[PDB]
Design a protein around this ligand. Structure first.
Ligand SMILES: CC(=O)Nc1cccc(-c2ccn([C@@H](Cc3cc[n+]([O-])cc3)c3ccc(OC(F)F)c(OCC4CC4)c3)n2)c1
Ligand SMILES: [Zn+2]
Ligand SMILES: [Zn+2]
Length: 331
């Protein structure tokens, strides 16, 4: 009575690393009875005093979080609640980077974290292209346009209507409309088809980079604010390779399982399969190296530049991991 159970205490101790890059999220997933998203989100909300700032009733926050977590598929290897929790915690750490100290408002912080929590809800385990090519209801509903991302948003928002789930019930119409717009802009930016444009804009920003007195990033207009937030959650979404190898490897195993599974369906449907999704002709090591060289490193290198030198350690880990997988390539 009043005191945590032994498993709850062990979980609480793991959660003490919530502000660190490399949180044992899989461990937390096990300790919380597969409730990584709910506990990590609750920990972050209270850490950031978001409940008080936005007058979010605690029972309501917990109810919505568990409901949201329940709408992630536990039978999906990668795009599940653990990934959601990871992206959330990673965005949380990124928001704390010294270069962005005092830059964003509480509402923007709330938008970035909420966006992260719902960015992949109800993911079926197959890609937009697969959905489009199989004439799936989802693809027809959203006209082949950022199919999954539009769906994650619609679900994320619709769940607020369930019993005692409206965590934004006390925000004014102004706060809600602004919050909603920012969340929509952020989740839509997670669609990989927008990667090049986002990176281009981020690079341009690093080019025109301008700080303040204390050397903190200066962002005037909404376009700049939202771009940085969009790239932030995007970085968090593509952060697996920048985490300690032990974590990175579990992510790779999961994504490969999900991809090979899709490949198996395409093979049966008689569709063409990418080496990436072909369990028969697949080079996991090469795929990760390509992934890092063409996508992850160019992204994180530009982000490192924007907040230089705050992300120096993350970049070093990415490069060490890249070399690890490279040397793993058989011959
Ligand atoms: C079947 C399928 O989706 N194929 C496909 C085709 C082209 C690019 C990508 C793609 C680009 C970024 N990712 C994300 C996961 C991700 C997927 C989609 N969006 O909207 C955002 C992120 C992604 C995250 C982690 C990965 O590996 C490891 F870190 F766990 C990964 O591995 C890529 C290598 C297998 C070769 C890809 N996925 C995926
Ligand atoms: Zn996604
Ligand atoms: Zn994702």
């Amino acid at each position: 009575f009043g005191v945590k159970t032994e498993q709850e205490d062990v979980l609480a101790k793991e959660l003490e690393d919530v502000n660190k890059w490399g949180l044992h999220v899989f461990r937390i997933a096990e300790l919380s009875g597969n409730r990584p998203l709910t506990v990590i989100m609750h920990t972050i909300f209270q850490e950031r005093d978001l409940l008080k700032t936005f007058k979010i009733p605690v029972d309501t926050l917990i109810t919505y979080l568990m409901t949201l977590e329940d709408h992630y598929h536990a039978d999906v290897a990668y795009h599940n609640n653990i990934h959601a929790a990871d992206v959330v915690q990673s965005t949380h750490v990124l928001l704390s980077t010294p270069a962005l100290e005092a830059v964003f408002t509480d509402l923007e912080i709330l938008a970035a974290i909420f966006a992260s929590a719902i960015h992949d809800v109800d993911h079926p385990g197959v890609s937009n292209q697969f959905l489009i090519n199989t004439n799936s209801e989802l693809a027809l509903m959203y006209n082949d346009s950022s199919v999954l991302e539009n769906h994650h948003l619609a679900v994320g928002f619709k769940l607020l209507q369930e019993e005692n789930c409206d965590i934004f019930q006390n925000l004014t119409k102004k706060q809600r409309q602004s919050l909603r717009k920012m969340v929509i802009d952020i989740v839509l930016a997670t669609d990989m088809s927008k990667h090049m444009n986002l990176l281009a804009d981020l690079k341009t920003m690093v080019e025109t980079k301008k700080v303040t007195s204390s050397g903190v990033l200066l962002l005037d207009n909404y376009s700049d604010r939202i771009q940085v937030l969009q790239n932030m959650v995007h970085c968090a979404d593509l952060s697996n390779p920048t985490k300690p190898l032990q974590l990175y490897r579990q992510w790779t195993d999961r994504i490969m399982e999900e991809f090979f599974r899709q490949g198996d369906r395409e093979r049966e449907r008689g569709m063409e399969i990418s080496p990436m999704c072909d369990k028969h002709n697949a080079s996991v090591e090469k795929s990760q190296v390509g992934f890092i060289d063409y996508i992850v490193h160019p992204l994180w290198e530009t982000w490192a530049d924007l907040v230089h030198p705050d992300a120096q350690d993350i970049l070093d880990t990415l490069e060490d991991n890249r070399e690890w997988y490279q040397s793993t390539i058989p011959q």
